[PDB]
């Protein structure tokens, strides 16, 4: 996977301590790329298990659709997480030629 | 399977886009042909996974018992799904000699 | 299950439209056969989901203990549901030799 | 889902910032298409969680019944939300041939 | 629910604009069919929330007991709401064979 | 639970019709064994729901602390409920060796 | 509640039109069975709301203490309400074996 | 509420500065449509709080009974408020077809 | 929410110390945009809890309807709060292009 | 809570019969440590419910601020309750090392 | 597992009737050794299922971290469960050499 | 397997209709002979599949440890299943010499 | 989490006995960093459950946004909790290099 967008996902996996504050439920309505099935199973997981057990499923599902980085950055800014959004944006431009 | 009732089940499999609005949980009490084990495992699946992941299991289990079309049509009418019920009834009479 | 009491439970499953007005919460204190765990989980379900989603769990739990029909009839009479109580009593005597 | 009415629902999902002011509780009595079970579980969710956590459940439940757009527009006008009602009506006619 | 009395309740749900003037508190003493628990929780709801938020709970609770239409009509006449009482009485006779 | 004090609690569960007149709010200050959290949640329940919906929570919470029978009897006598207090005292001595 | 005294209370609930002339404030000093808390909250309700809004609270509180019928009859006679007192006394003897 | 009489009530809500001189107590005897409970609670409110705090309750209660505009106009003329009465009468005829 | 009117609401949330003197009850009649349900629940909250506990509910409800800033400024001037009204007006023009 | 001041609060909870004569309203102006919100909600509770229903809220609110025992003793002496004030002072010194 | 601390856990498993009164929710804040994920999933389980269904998960999670017996004893004493705390402490010293 | 205890297990296999009411989850804490691995996998099965699909695994696992009949009988009595417990006890003594 | 601000949160978790007097409702308006959804769900929890059951949710939500310590200290000083505010400030400087 030698693409700029896919390599951003590997950054999240290697740095998980600073992405644990993302709340799954509040950010779901602001990600329109997720399908009806994908957006329904995530809420079921959060009801059964905890919240941080769903974080892996959210990120794993998000990266499937191309162009997910732009939507992820926009959602973080609108949910008062500007510090995290700026960090992701800098990493995205570090890989594009 | 050259029977009128079995051939109705093949219609559901080929046309799944218009049967995705059937809610599994609300329609379960109105299907008395399902056994205690069959009606218990379906609720467990809906709690673990999503709702649409259970739709295949509901239809696959329903077709086992003969005479399931009449009960399926009656349940759909009583749950404010008359448009879907009329579609299934027309297909049922299209195969009977 | 060729017993008179168990066959009464099958009557409830097949005729659910006329048993939907039974309120779970108000009738719980008048059913002393339910255990502490059984009576605690039912209230949790009613708080999370709706009321009619709990009706199946109440009837499924009630039939486990033998002699539950007499307690069910007595509770219905004491909660101003005499019409439903008389219907169940007639069905109970229709199966006893 | 290449239907005019279903494609209106996708507009709501993609534009959620301007539909967050719809109050679930006050608009429920003005939507007669919702069933007794559907109208009961929504109030339970609003009591347990917040109000905006119920907005997704309201819209997801509403779109199941065909012809829900006409009832949704009428309710919005009667609840002093004419600006939002006009926006939805224009989108509805943008898809009909 | 193909009964004359139950079908009257569906009329109230579909026509809510003309039943919003019924005051819950003043009409409670004139409905003797309500139980002690049912009549106690309604007053608690009116103290916490508003008055119109209780209207749904009053009608939902009233329809559980059979023969509630006769008591509802009598209470409306005695509370200077004869215009509303006559409307309900005409609907009741429109369904009886 | 083959203890004299625990077996008294089972008497209350089986005979609930004669313990429905105990007012939760007035008797709370006279039960010093309840903790600050336990005494705070009970008042919240009485404000939201009715009064008899709290009776189960009061008795379920009371039996956790050993020696609760002596405090319960004393509170009943001081609140002009001597007839109920004498009934409980007789049951308590019926189980002690 | 198959007791003679409790069944008298159900008579009051079913016949409320002829018990609306009982003034709460003037009859309170002549009911010594009411506790200090019970007699204090009733006056607060009469000051905030009207007078007939307190009638339900007076009767609901009165029936908690056994032997309340004898005190109620005596108070009615002493407040120039002999016609109402005779009606209640006849009902009381209609249930005693 | 697309009725001529109901739309008159919305005029009062939007123009409150010119309806603040209506005295609640003096006009109550000249409104015979108010019930005994409704006419009793209004006087209790005026004794506890001020006078203008009762104006909202008077208008909110008055509009419940149909035909209240004719009685309101007649009372205003008889209490030396002819200027206000003429204003309301003109608005009433502005909505009737 | 990159709109001039919505951004004014965020100013109120961040500066709450200078908006605590707004009395909810006296300003309600001068805000005609509030619906009958919205204006009824606010008075119930002020009766149950204190006055400042209602301030959040008033501001949260007010911002739902567009054009609420003009009505809010006019009400403040008419209630002898000109100093607060001028502060809000200056902030409103600081965001409009 | 192994502090001298906190352990004094537990004395009040265990001995409530001798602290029931403290009038909430008259003693409020002599407790300057209470905040504006805390002093406003207490008066609302006394108007709605009785007086003794507020006693728990007064003591629960008072103990939050450290150094409340000295202010409580001073207020009791100034309100002609010297007998109660001396009892509390002796208990306070019984816990200090 | 021939360690003193691990062998204490086996005592709890074999004697479960006397550990059923431990409330999971109230004791969670007083166990700082639990991680954020561990303390979040327990509350989710208590909301979905009952309370006693969570007791096994609490004890199974607690024993993972060494030195959990000292924290467990301290929490029990501070929650008015001294009788249970003394029983556990005696068992702990019965295994240490 | 010509042993008295093993031959009791064959009775359960041949008579399964009368052992289907045993709830796996509630009876697990009362069977201390099960190991940590054995007690963990059973809960996983009940979450994935239904409840009756776990009954075979519970009985198959229980019979491995000698002396399991005494623990099984004791658990059944303590879970209000005395009728089933007496049946098993009689069978156990039917095989011992 | 080797950051000065995150390590302050661990201090609160380990020392909960001295942070139990923080009232959730009164301090919410003085924390502008909380979002509209976050500030709405907290009030719903306080209405359903008690007050101390919400304390964990308040602290867990607060720590998500960076720079929350400065706002927390300022709110505590303004709510007459200077003793607690000074304790937190000293801990904050104990971790900064």
UniProtKB/Swiss-Prot annotation, chains A, B, C, D, E, F, G, H, I, J, K, L, M:
The phosphorylated pLxIS motif constitutes an IRF3-binding motif, leading to recruitment of the transcription factor IRF3 to induce type-I interferons and other cytokines. Ubiquitinated. Undergoes 'Lys-48'-linked polyubiquitination catalyzed by ITCH; ITCH-dependent polyubiquitination is mediated by the interaction with PCBP2 and leads to MAVS/IPS1 proteasomal degradation. Ubiquitinated by RNF125, leading to its degradation by the proteasome. Undergoes 'Lys-48'-linked ubiquitination catalyzed by SMURF1. A lipid is attached at residue 79 (S-palmitoyl cysteine). It is found in: Mitochondrion outer membrane; Mitochondrion; Peroxisome. Residues 10-77 form the CARD domain. Changing residue 54 to A: Impairs ability to induce IFN-beta. Loss of interaction with the ATG5-ATG12 conjugate. There is a cross-link at residues 7, 10 (Glycyl lysine isopeptide (Lys-Gly) (interchain with G-Cter in ubiquitin)). Changing residue 56 to A/E/R: Impairs filament formation and abolishes antiviral signaling activity. The modification N-acetylproline is found at residue 2. Present in T-cells, monocytes, epithelial cells and hepatocytes (at protein level). Ubiquitously expressed, with highest levels in heart, skeletal muscle, liver, placenta and peripheral blood leukocytes. Residues 10-77 are annotated as: Required for interaction with NLRX1. Self-associates and polymerizes (via CARD domains) to form 400 nM long three-stranded helical filaments on mitochondria, filament nucleation requires interaction with RIGI whose CARD domains act as a template for filament assembly. Interacts with RIGI, IFIH1/MDA5, TRAF2, TRAF6 and C1QBP. May interact with FADD, RIPK1, CHUK and IKBKB. Interacts (when phosphorylated) with IRF3; following activation and phosphorylation on the pLxIS motif by TBK1, recruits IRF3. Interacts with NLRX1. Interaction with NLRX1 requires the CARD domain. Interacts with PSMA7. Interacts with TRAFD1. Adapter required for innate immune defense against viruses. Acts downstream of DHX33, RIGI and IFIH1/MDA5, which detect intracellular dsRNA produced during viral replication, to coordinate pathways leading to the activation of NF-kappa-B, IRF3 and IRF7, and to the subsequent induction of antiviral cytokines such as IFNB and RANTES (CCL5). Peroxisomal and mitochondrial MAVS act sequentially to create an antiviral cellular state. The pLxIS motif constitutes an IRF3-binding motif: following phosphorylation by TBK1, the phosphorylated pLxIS motif of MAVS recruits IRF3. IRF3 is then phosphorylated and activated by TBK1 to induce type-I interferons and other cytokines. Both CARD and transmembrane domains are essential for antiviral function. The CARD domain is responsible for interaction with RIGI and IFIH1/MDA5. This is Mitochondrial antiviral-signaling protein. It comes from Homo sapiens (Human). The gene is MAVS.
